[PDB]
């Protein structure tokens, strides 16, 4: 069972080149059944194919993107890869990397990767508890670009737990909540650590939520 | 350059329910379209290609019907994970292009939400901010009124609220609102209170707290 994953900048500022690669991995790339494609989804132009390259070199791009669109293979490292230049905040969106069967079906996507355009630059974000069956959190806040990933004592705790979508503060920075509820009873012998990874800025936060 | 058109853009039914969403294209593509299902937070995921053909290893209550210019999606039974938007996609000829999606979500019976405030904790206003969070978990329908009061005043336009996609188990929704003020506002009042209006409440739910106790 193959797996796709794009890895890239998720900021990149206006008229630069956007870079992202895939990452082929338990397949080989050099296989003739296949086109190897890049999708984005964004809310002003809903999903949109980009383009995709044969394994024997052979592009087509969406002729709507066909100026600053440049897609590449490695076949040394199973990679394919997407340059998109000169972007611009339009070009915010959720990037995928996509396997196309020759005979025309979309039958794996990476799990897609977050791309914002903007001026500014990173930050990493706050992380303040949410104290207290109960409800405990975490409150995530002063970062930029979306996404944060939050887990719950690195996995374990999976049931009940809610991230919320994140909101703009004044600042323009982001803000959500992490909660999850828990019986009463556990406040006075479990511990429960919020796991905060904010990939932009290279962000790791743990913190231990206590009554 | 094929437009397709889908339809409803959004519908919500009952679990068992027979739903049926249409593709239609703007010119004839035979049997060129495949149908995807978007669960909350993931990829897109192929369920029918050529129009018709069900995709290996997934349920039988998916299929697709339809060729030429119009295309019917079809779930047999509807079930609590059937939640997702889905699209239709041509490739006829290049570009390949999707449709607008339709949202696919539950009608379930009432649920009331359980409420819960949280004070900003004193590490936040170290950082000059101060969020007040009110929690609404595992509540249905959608709709909810959340009102905030300082003092017995009433806010408005100082807060944000933020919902999470319908569960894929129980059909309910979780909501979070935020009172965004700063620690010079914060600390020069005491009471700070939480009202909730949704339908499966009979009086409105109030929730509050003094700062400090
Ligand atoms: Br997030
Ligand atoms: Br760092
Ligand atoms: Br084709």
């Known amino acids: 069972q193959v797996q796709l994953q794009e890895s890239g900048p998720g900021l990149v500022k206006p008229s630069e080149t956007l870079s992202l690669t895939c990452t082929v991995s338990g397949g080989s790339v050099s296989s003739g059944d296949y086109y190897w494609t890049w999708i984005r989804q964004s809310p002003g132009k809903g999903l949109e194919w980009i383009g995709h390259?044969?394994?024997?070199?052979?592009?087509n791009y969406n002729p709507s993107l066909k100026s600053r669109l440049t897609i590449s293979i490695d076949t040394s490292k199973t990679q394919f890869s997407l340059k998109l230049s000169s972007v611009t905040a339009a070009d915010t969106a959720i990037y995928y990397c996509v396997r196309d069967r020759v005979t025309g079906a979309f039958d794996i996507w990476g799990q897609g990767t977050m791309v914002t355009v903007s001026s500014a630059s990173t930050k990493g974000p706050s992380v303040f508890p949410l104290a207290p069956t109960a409800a405990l959190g975490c409150q995530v806040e002063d970062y930029f670009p979306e996404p944060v990933t939050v887990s719950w004592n690195s996995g374990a705790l999976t049931s009940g737990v809610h991230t919320f979508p994140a909101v703009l503060q004044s600042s323009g920075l982001y803000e959500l909540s992490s909660v999850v509820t828990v019986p009463s009873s556990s406040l006075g012998t479990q511990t429960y650590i919020c796991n905060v990874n904010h990939k932009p800025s290279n962000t790791k936060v743990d913190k231990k939520v206590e009554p | 350059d094929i437009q397709m058109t889908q339809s409803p853009s959004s519908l919500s039914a009952s679990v068992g329910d027979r739903v049926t969403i249409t593709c239609q294209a703007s010119?004839?593509?035979?049997?060129?379209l495949n149908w995807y299902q978007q669960k909350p937070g993931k990829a897109p995921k192929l369920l029918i290609y050529?129009?018709?053909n069900l995709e290996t290893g997934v349920p039988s209550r998916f299929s697709g019907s339809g060729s030429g210019t119009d295309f019917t999606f079809t779930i047999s039974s509807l079930q609590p994970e059937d939640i997702a938007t889905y699209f239709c996609?041509?490739?006829?000829?290049?570009?390949?292009?999707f449709g607008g999606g339709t949202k696919v979500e539950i009608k379930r019976t009432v649920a009331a939400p359980s409420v819960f405030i949280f004070p900003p904790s004193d590490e936040q206003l170290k950082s000059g901010r101060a969020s007040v969070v009110c929690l609404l978990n595992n509540f249905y329908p959608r709709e909810a009124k959340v009102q905030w009061k300082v003092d017995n005043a009433l806010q408005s336009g100082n807060s944000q609220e933020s919902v999470t996609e319908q569960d894929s188990k129980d059909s309910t929704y979780s909501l979070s609102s935020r009172l965004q003020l700063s620690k010079a506002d914060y600390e020069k009042h005491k009471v700070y209170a939480c009202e909730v209006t949704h339908q499966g409440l009979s009086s409105p739910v109030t929730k509050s707290f003094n700062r400090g106790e």
């Open positions: 390259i044969y394994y024997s070199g052979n592009t």
């Open positions: 050529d129009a018709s």
């Open positions: 010119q004839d593509i035979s049997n060129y």
């Open positions: 996609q041509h490739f006829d000829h290049l570009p390949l292009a």
